[PDB]
Symmetry: C2
Subunit: 572 residues, 2 copies
């Protein structure tokens, strides 16, 4: 039942069954050859009289060993290659999913956790498919075959002693758990002492000033004493684990092998049987670790598969709504919009507003209100539930989301880099129009070519994977150049305007004011520099729009009491 999701996940990469089955069967054959090797050893050792004729047995054993090595090598290569192909397919599906369907809010939930889950679960699935399932089949077959062959070879006497010895595990394993518990307690006490010292030492100034340093010494003494006491207890428990373990193991060892020697000396049908017995004991003991590791890795992998299938279950639409974009220039209306992240909370309540076309609109919001929710809302990163964000006659649910996103230019505050080269930063505006070779010319129009006129290069200019050698002012100029290049129709801005000061702000204002003199813009930042360039201003408070009209007189009057109190809170 629980293996059905894992089988389906493997089935997503369909052409991966025949070669896996062949590899597993070949591994089984290799295990059987390994089982057969000690019988050849016994036959050789019983052919004692003719050393020269024992050369034939030596050659046969060498040939069998080489055949086993070759078969195991081919099976391992097939298993690993098929597992790598399965992992490539799984990662391909996961990356196709995460980038495309997961909506912005899903990525806001957890960014690093998503990547950690993807990588760790893919690695765990690889480890399960390539090694642990084949390892478990190999171990089970080897153990069963070895026990059967020992039963056939020795009558019962040595083998029942061997199977009784596992009682040594019943005597040893629980004591190891007590050892582990004591060691963990010691580690905890050491961590506590380290924390105490890491607290005391940085405050050394206060101690030395207070002239109470010796008192701290006394406190430190106590800590040391504590650890010493615990150490003593560990020592005592060690004196119960150190010898005893060895004793039991050695005793068990002797018993088994001792009986073998007994059966050799008593004339019982054992000799080469004893040699084969020791080899079979090795081949029995070794795969138990593989079996236990598989049993634990299955428990890890079922949860890994649950996480992966949780990732793969998300959904989204891009052009499913329709395709009805023709002009995308018409006044934008908010009509009774009331929706946030979850319908229960209702973080937005009946938000309505009117904005003209080709008209500059500013948004002023508080530190903790609904400015961020609205900012994401006029980007449609959230799906409307009750209200209507209507461009014209509610076509926003009618045409494609990609079509609108193509007609809008976004820069909020940082928008740092898409790592690579500036060629990537200007080629993100390649919507099948490839922009021919005018990009640099556009950089000249966007006041970016003259700024970049130093030219370390144009295509080999690397910002680096980290992207730290270029400051903010240049990168927002590049972002605005990209926005102008792409599709200067509608711009929504959170004002990249920061601590750049006069030169950068004036340059961006001249670039923008010239560019959108006939195009619609929205501004949502805090400062009052864009609002004077904004012919219409709004205000967000408690998840509600409160304020409409022009800037000067209205925010001279509307902002007299409550917005002024909010400001006085802001600088304070």
């Amino acid at each position: 039942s629980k293996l059905k999701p894992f089988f389906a996940l493997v089935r997503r990469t369909n052409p991966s069954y025949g070669k896996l089955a062949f590899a597993l069967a070949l591994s089984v054959v290799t295990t059987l050859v390994s089982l057969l090797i000690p019988l050849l050893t016994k036959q050789l050792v019983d052919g004692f009289s003719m050393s020269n004729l024992s050369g034939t047995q030596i050659g046969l054993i060498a040939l069998v060993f080489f055949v086993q090595a070759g078969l195991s090598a081919y099976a391992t290569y097939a298993l690993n290659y098929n597992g790598q192909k399965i992992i490539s397919g799984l990662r391909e599906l996961l990356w196709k999913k995460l980038i495309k369907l997961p909506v912005s809010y899903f990525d806001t939930n957890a960014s690093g956790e998503t990547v950690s889950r993807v990588t760790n679960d893919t690695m765990v699935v690889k480890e399960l498919i390539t090694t642990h399932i084949s390892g478990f089949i190999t171990g089970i077959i080897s153990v069963i075959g070895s026990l059967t062959i020992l039963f056939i070879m020795n009558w019962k006497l040595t083998l029942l002693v061997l199977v009784v010895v596992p009682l040594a595990a019943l005597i040893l394993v629980p004591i190891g758990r007590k050892m582990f518990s004591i060691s963990r307690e010691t580690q905890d006490e050491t961590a506590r002492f380290t924390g105490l010292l890491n607290q005391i030492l940085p405050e050394i100034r206060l101690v030395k000033a207070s002239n109470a340093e010796d008192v701290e010494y006394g406190r430190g003494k106590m800590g040391i004493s504590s650890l010493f006491k615990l150490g003593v207890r560990e020592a005592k428990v060690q004196s119960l684990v150190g010898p005893l373990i060895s004793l039991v193991l050695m005793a068990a060892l002797v018993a088994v092998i001792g009986y073998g020697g007994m059966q050799v000396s008593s004339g019982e049908l054992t000799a080469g049987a004893l040699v084969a017995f020791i080899l079979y004991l090795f081949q029995i003991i070794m795969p138990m670790g593989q079996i236990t590791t598989f049993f634990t890795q299955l428990q890890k992998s079922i949860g890994a598969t649950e996480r992966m299938i949780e990732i793969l279950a998300e959904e989204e639409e891009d052009t499913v709504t329709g395709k009805q974009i023709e002009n995308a220039h018409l006044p934008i209306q908010l009509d009774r919009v009331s929706f946030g992240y979850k319908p229960d909370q209702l973080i937005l309540k009946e938000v309505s507003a009117v904005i003209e076309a080709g008209k500059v609109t500013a948004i002023v919001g508080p530190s903790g209100g609904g400015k961020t929710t609205l900012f994401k809302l006029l980007e449609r990163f959230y799906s409307p539930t009750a209200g209507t964000i209507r461009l014209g006659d509610e076509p926003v649910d009618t045409y494609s989301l990609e079509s609108w996103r193509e007609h809008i230019g976004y820069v909020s505050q940082e928008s740092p880099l898409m790592s690579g080269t500036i060629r990537e930063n200007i080629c993100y505006g390649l919507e099948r129009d490839v922009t021919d070779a005018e990009i640099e010319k556009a950089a000249e129009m966007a006041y970016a070519l003259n700024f970049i006129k130093e030219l370390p290069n144009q295509f080999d200019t690397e910002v680096g994977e980290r992207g730290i050698m270029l400051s903010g002012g240049q990168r927002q100029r590049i972002a605005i150049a990209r926005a102008l290049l792409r599709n200067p129709s509608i711009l929504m801005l959170d004002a990249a305007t920061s601590s750049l000061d006069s030169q950068s702000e004036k340059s961006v204002q001249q670039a923008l004011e010239v560019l959108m003199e006939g195009r619609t813009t929205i501004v949502i930042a805090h400062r009052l520099s864009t609002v004077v360039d904004a012919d219409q201003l709004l205000f967000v408070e408690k998840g509600e729009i409160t304020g409409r009209g022009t800037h000067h007189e209205l925010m001279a009057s509307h902002g007299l009491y409550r917005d002024f109190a909010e400001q006085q809170l802001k600088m304070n």
Copy 2:
């Protein structure tokens, strides 16, 4: 040569030799008994036939086993107990030295690293003392004795094969190293892929905004393809290693033990010597890990010893200079003080000033000048080199450094607490006077009891190890009180004044003004609130004192041109 520092460092805890030597000798005799066990096994095997004397041999073997168990248990307990006493002594010495001597600038050189060298290095030294040295001695003795006994037992035939076999390990090692290199390459490429993915997700907003969801998918696919290629290479190299390890190890085991059976069957004198040989082979193979680990950990132990001896080398003085304090009320004068942290840099140049006694003095410094260095110099953590901070005619050269710090109470806005209870906080200065039981009365005069009048308790009030449940103003007020009870003769202030607001600042200022009017006071902080209360002010610029006199008219004039520009920079 290199072991002399470690021997001396252990010698610092002198009475730890005889019992350690006895424990080591008992471990040696335990190893000898372990060597003796297989010979008794062989004698039992040769007895084989008749029953009751076989029972006597079994009883002898059990007695030898239990004797080994008891002796090993006692040796392990003695070794561990002596090691824990040694580690207690070492940690005690380290904590004494660390708290008492090192002057503050040593502690600010490195804080967490010092605690790490206190804890982890001691753990390494204890591990070497308790287990690894005894482990190495017992392992070398066991290996040599087992080889010698095998040489006596089997003439040369089986042991020569056994010692020629390590050619198998010689072949094995380079292949394992290539495995490790390929695994590290895989880890590195997985790290790069995770870094790429962790880079992309934060920029998901831009990715969707630029409608470029597919090229980013393509970059992810390229990364997945690179990882798949490297995984295929890892598979091709893996398919050779594992089969080779299995083949070579199984072949060596088959060779050795099949030759043992060859001798036991050929009528060669290997009757029960085969069983004895297998037991001795296990006793040989098992202790190789200890011998390898002793060599691995020796370098770490020697490094830990070097770090400890480096810790123990720092020197300092408290009352060595002299003892000539009588009243401790004289005007403080600076005489061409020129020194910072290192003589070559000369971060201070001929700093001189005149400050009266019982007069409040405030210091004004820039953001990056010498205000902090002069702050720490007035509190004299630093030892003068060229100039002289002269208070009292050079008796400042010959009274106790400690005796002065008695007369000064340190309070700053940073200082959170010393973790524990309020009782410790108010009575840390039990400078042999213990203040009888005047602490509560002291609180009531010093405006602490009336503020703490809520009384969760007076002695059980715990501020916690973290100390997060109380705000800065309260702890600053308790620190001011503590200054008022240690020795209210000289006061130094960084102005505890923070964001508490006039309601607390004026109150604490009037409290200290009433309490500390007739005695000296020193202020160094930024604001201009204590400056009006300070009779004389100074100014620090470029590591030089520039400005002396009263407050109002002079910094109405002196601060008009240059200090005003610094202020305008501060607000900007």
